[PDB]
């Protein structure tokens, strides 16, 4: 499979309720492995997966000091954002950032990412070339100019092609028994009468990892996308995920419907139907 590492930063102001909160979570693929929360009693970058616990004190100290600095930097960024949007200090606002690297199946850098949002709207993104910026608005153009002067893209490109890949490969090796193990979905079709005229067929996928999956209903071989209720893929709590897709079918027509499941843990795409 193709692997990725991502850090997610959130800074949330809250006037009248203390200084802005700053959190960091890091993921490899769909596995969270570190967290930082400025609201903690003694804020530290802390492990959230077993395979990172073996990193030495120097690791945790560096991650913590950078995150504590980031707490201060993003409080300053929130103050700056108020000036960039002519906003008052009375309202709550949010800066978000994500960055990291994707590895191809060959294990080399496939692409790098660094994007920010303000109040849930895209703000600035590092372009795929890892050397130019796309600003979303005239405020982000000010940031762009500052980052061009401070060679921010150059530092990011170096990180994303070097350390980010190297650390991701280390994590993948240390957590090989889980990070490099796909768990296929356990799949079933259930039947839920609605009336004497109609019933819901619900195609389930349970216990799969990673989260990426495709579930589709066909009727007589025609995809039923516009007629399928597809819930968002959801965490089970044990690292795996769940999803279902449901169609409303005329009673007695159930055997014309087939559920199709694609997941990288499967040797071949699965086809299921209701088995009464």
């Amino acid at each position: 499979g193709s692997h990725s590492m991502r850090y997610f930063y959130t800074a949330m102001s809250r006037p009248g309720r203390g200084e802005p909160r700053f959190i960091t979570v890091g993921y490899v693929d769909d596995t969270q492995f570190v967290r930082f929360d400025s609201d903690a009693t003694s804020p530290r970058m802390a492990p959230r997966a077993p395979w990172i616990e073996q990193e030495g004190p120097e690791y945790w100290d560096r991650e913590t000091q950078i995150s504590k600095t980031n707490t201060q930097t993003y409080r300053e960024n929130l103050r700056t954002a108020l000036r960039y949007y002519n906003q008052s200090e009375a309202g709550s606002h949010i800066i978000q950032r994500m960055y990291g690297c994707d590895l191809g199946p060959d294990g080399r850098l496939l692409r790098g990412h660094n994007q920010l949002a303000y109040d849930g709207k895209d703000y600035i993104a590092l372009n795929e070339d890892l050397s130019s910026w796309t600003a979303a608005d005239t405020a982000a153009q000010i940031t762009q100019l500052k980052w061009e002067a401070a060679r921010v893209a150059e530092q990011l490109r170096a990180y994303l092609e070097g350390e980010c890949v190297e650390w991701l490969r280390r994590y993948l090796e240390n957590g090989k028994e889980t990070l490099q193990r796909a768990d296929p979905p356990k799949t079933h079709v259930t039947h839920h009468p609605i009336s004497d005229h109609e019933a819901t067929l619900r195609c389930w996928a349970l216990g799969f990892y990673p989260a990426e999956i495709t579930l589709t209903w066909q009727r007589d071989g025609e995809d039923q996308t516009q007629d399928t209720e597809l819930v968002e893929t959801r965490p089970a709590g044990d690292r795996t995920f769940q999803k279902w897709a449901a169609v409303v079918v005329p009673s007695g027509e159930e055997q014309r419907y087939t559920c199709h499941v694609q997941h990288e843990g499967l040797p071949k795409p699965l086809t299921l139907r209701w088995e009464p």
Binding site: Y7, M45, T73
Partner: peptide
């Protein structure tokens, strides 16, 4: 491991 990009600012 996180990027050390302290000194970058909005």
């Amino acid at each position: 491991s996180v990027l050390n990009d302290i000194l970058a600012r909005l």
